[PDB]
Amino acid sequence: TLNGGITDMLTELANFEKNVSQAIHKYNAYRKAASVIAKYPHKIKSGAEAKKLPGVGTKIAEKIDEFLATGKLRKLEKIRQDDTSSSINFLTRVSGIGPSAARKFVDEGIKTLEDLRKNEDKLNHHQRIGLKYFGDFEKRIPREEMLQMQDIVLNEVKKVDSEYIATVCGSFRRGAESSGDMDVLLTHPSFTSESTKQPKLLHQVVEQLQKVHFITDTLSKGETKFMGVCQLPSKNDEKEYPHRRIDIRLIPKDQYYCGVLYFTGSDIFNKNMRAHALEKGFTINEYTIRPLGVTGVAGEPLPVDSEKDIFDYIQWKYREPKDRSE
DNA sequence: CCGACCGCGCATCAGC
DNA sequence: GCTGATGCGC
DNA sequence: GTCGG
Ligand SMILES: Nc1nc2c(ncn2[C@H]2C[C@H](O)[C@@H](COP(=O)(O)OP(=O)(O)[C@@H](Cl)P(=O)(O)O)O2)c(=O)[nH]1
Ligand SMILES: [Cl-]
Ligand SMILES: [Cl-]
Ligand SMILES: [Cl-]
Ligand SMILES: [Cl-]
Ligand SMILES: [Cl-]
Ligand SMILES: [Mg+2]
Ligand code: NA
Ligand code: NA
Ligand code: NA
Predict the structure, then answer these.
(1) Are A224 and A247 in contact (CB under 8 A)?
(2) Using a 6 Å cutoff on CB, does residue A180 contact ligand 1?
(3) Closest to A326 (Cα-Cα) out of A15, A51, A36
(4) Known consequence of changing residue 285 to D?
(5) CA-based diameter of chain A, in Å?
(6) Which in A121, A131, A145, A185 has the greatest CB count within 10 A?
(7) Paired residues of A267 in beta bridges
(8) What separation in angstroms does the CA of A90 have from each of A49, A112, A135, A293, A299?
(9) Mutation test of ligand 1: which of A227, A270, A286, A322 has the most ligand atoms closer than 8 Å to its C-beta?
(10) Dist. CA A275–CA A268, nearest whole Å
(11) Domains of chain A by range and CATH?
């Protein structure tokens, strides 16, 4: 919150670019600047000071000067007053509606929650569930609830096959006191980079969690990735918990460290780390770290026995998950 | 000045 | 059906 | 929008 006004402004600008302008690189540029400014340990006194930080250039520096002088930004004030920009921005808040669908809906005269609810037949499955839990999905999850959810997921997974390992990642693993959703990394000895010896490894787990009425809805589901909706059980006479987003990712057991690095994030941290990898001549995904050849072709997976080995390859000092919240 | 900007799973669609 | 491109979200 | 080279 030290430079909260500035970071909020950059984030609003980032969202505009992504949702309305459909300019993903401007979106990332603003997110990068917000992130660097968020961790800067001084109250920013000028745009020039800000411009010293990597990711902050001339245009953002001017915006910071305007914001510091006036408490606001004219570019944003106008954006807020633009009905078409306002409408697209709102619609993209529904899970499943992105920039393209949002602008398409607006073209068709569909621009409010009421419009969505009366045109439910124009929504795909993902969009329908996003609309249904629109309110719920914007509520954060207290770590206490995350702990209860972890306990259910771990125990239920254990009931299916004691050889499964489920790990809660995302901001939870980075020690955050609240989370937007739950991310679960899943392994089982049967599924490795070499072989898949049992079918339905993910399916069985999803099934059990639906069976106990923990998972309530499915957004998408394939052999290795589940994205859906869950809900803690409530007690007698007590109000129901909000429905929550849950993602489950089944990763080859021998590829756990790359997978846990990936699912812990943050997403900006992963982008930064992967970009650094490239500068050092490596490429990182959720499975492997590979050297890049003298032309640019990914080579063979390098041996990895800890998250820190991955840091070591790219000559970064190790950062604990708590220090990855960029 | 100017490409390059992380990397990928699932749903959905166009074209054959 | 299939492949491949796009959207969306992670 | 920013940056490296
Ligand atoms: N490489 C990469 N990894 C990503 C990206 N987006 C997400 N991930 C990885 C890293 C993310 O950490 C992880 C989960 O994605 P959530 O969006 O749930 O992000 P968080 O859990 O961090 C928090 Cl926003 P919280 O949900 O508690 O509010 O997936 C991406 O664009 N690129
Ligand atoms: Cl762009
Ligand atoms: Cl403003
Ligand atoms: Cl690994
Ligand atoms: Cl790989
Ligand atoms: Cl930590
Ligand atoms: Mg999360
Ligand atoms: Na700078
Ligand atoms: Na959306
Ligand atoms: Na998630």
Answers:
(1) no
(2) yes
(3) A36
(4) Found in a gastric cancer sample; uncertain significance
(5) 66
(6) A185
(7) none
(8) 34, 8, 13, 45, 44
(9) A270
(10) 11
(11) 4-82 (1.10.150.110), 83-139 (1.10.150.20), 140-262 (3.30.460.10), 263-325 (3.30.210.10)
- Rounded distance, CA A180 to CA A21, Å? 25
Could you count the other beta carbons within 10 Å of the beta carbon of residue A94? 24
Instruction: Report yes or no: A266 and A324 within 8 Å, Cβ to Cβ.
Output: yes
Helix (H, G, I), strand (E, B) or coil at A136: helix
Proximal ligand: closest to the CA of A287: 5
CA A198 – CA A142 distance, rounded (Å): 36
Tokens encoding A117:
């609810």
Alpha-carbon distance A48 to A37, whole Å?
13
Contact A265, A174 (CB under 8 A): yes
Enumerate the β-bridge partners of residue A298: A292
Residue found under tokens 């839990």: A133
Give the method of determination: X-ray
Nearest nucleotide to A270 by CA–C1' distance?
A: B6
List alpha helices for A121-222, DSSP H.
125-132, 134-137, 143-160, 170-173, 201-211
A95 pocket-lining for ligand 1 (C-beta < 6 Å) = no
- Specify the 3-state DSSP secondary structure of A211: helix
Q: Which of A32, A43, A52, A63 is catalytic?
A: A63
The whole-angstrom separation of Cα A207 and Cα A130 is 21
Within 10 angstroms of residue A62's Cβ, the number of other Cβ atoms is 12
- Closest by CA to A265, choosing from A144, A164, A183, A154, is A183
